[PDB]
Structure 1
Amino acid sequence: SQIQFTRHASDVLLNLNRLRSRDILTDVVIVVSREQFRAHKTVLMACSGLFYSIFTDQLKRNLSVINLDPEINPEGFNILLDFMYTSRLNLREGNIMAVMATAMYLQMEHVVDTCRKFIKAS
């Protein structure tokens, strides 16, 4: 017998995004071409297969500054990073290309799937 708090997880994520906005306990800077992004490694690992792999591998686990592949563009990463901390994704025909490629690179199948559906729809 347990009590289920329906909004707990969502409330936790809100507060994690609050901490991100004020740069509290952020422990990694993601560099994407010309832009810097600060985040929590734990959240990154919780939302991306790439980051889960990096931060559990003996080569890159302790890095505090990560450089994504040059082909990734900052606009797409910003979108997916905001999704990580909000569960919300702003998808349009003008950014779907970048969003889908970034999500495939970050290994985030749900966004990829949603992108594929968005394409075959329009």
Structure 2
Amino acid sequence: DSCIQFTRHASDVLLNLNRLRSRDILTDVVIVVSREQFRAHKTVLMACSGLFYSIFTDQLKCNLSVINLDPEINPEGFCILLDFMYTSRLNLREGNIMAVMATAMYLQMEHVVDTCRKFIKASE
């Protein structure tokens, strides 16, 4: 086509989706990770995660307002990945890298799994 493109548009959209998440606006699901609860938008979760994409395209699960994750999932690892989904920024640290990588593998977030593998390999 002969379209023009606004470079900062995708980043501006994601910034506003994060602002709606912070103010709890039009969030339509609560993700339960052991004792912890995280409110989010189903569309953003599907757009970022192979696991959520599979869950919310399922004819019965698409209508659930609560999703319970596997008890082995660490709430902090999930929180870090949820923040990444809404911001593009990953808070990866020596003390959380193992939990973040295991959570990213479970959530099917291949780019996160890739950088965790590289950061671990460098420390070996």
Q: TM-score range by the shorter chain?
A: over 0.9
Return the alpha-carbon distance in structure 1 between the equivalents of residues 115 and 58 of structure 2.
Answer: 29
What residue is the counterpart of 2:83 in the other structure? 82
Return the alpha-carbon distance in structure 1 between the equivalents of residues 55 and 73 of structure 2.
Answer: 17
Return the alpha-carbon distance in structure 2 between the equivalents of residues 21 and 115 of structure 1.
Answer: 27
What SS is found at the alignment partner of 2:60? coil
Cα RMSD of the aligned pairs, angstroms, is 0.6
The share of aligned pairs that are identical, in percent, is 98
Aligned-residue offset at 1:58: 2.3
What residue is the counterpart of 1:30 in the other structure? 31
Aligned-residue offset at 1:26: 0.1
Report the count of equivalent residues: 122
- 1:53-87 per-residue CA deviation (whole Å, 9 max, x = no partner) reads 00011231110000000000100000000000000
User: What 5-or-longer segments of structure 2 have no aligned partner?
Assistant: none
4+ long deviations beyond 4 Å: none
TM-score, structure 1 normalization: 0.98
- 1:89-113 per-residue CA deviation (whole Å, 9 max, x = no partner) reads 0111110000000000000000000
Return the alpha-carbon distance in structure 1 between the equivalents of residues 46 and 84 of structure 2.
Answer: 14
- 1:28-63 per-residue CA deviation (whole Å, 9 max, x = no partner) reads 000000110000000000000000000011231110
What residue is the counterpart of 2:109 in the other structure? 108
Aligned-residue offset at 1:88: 0.2
User: What 5-or-longer segments of structure 1 have no aligned partner?
Assistant: none
TM-score, structure 2 normalization: 0.97
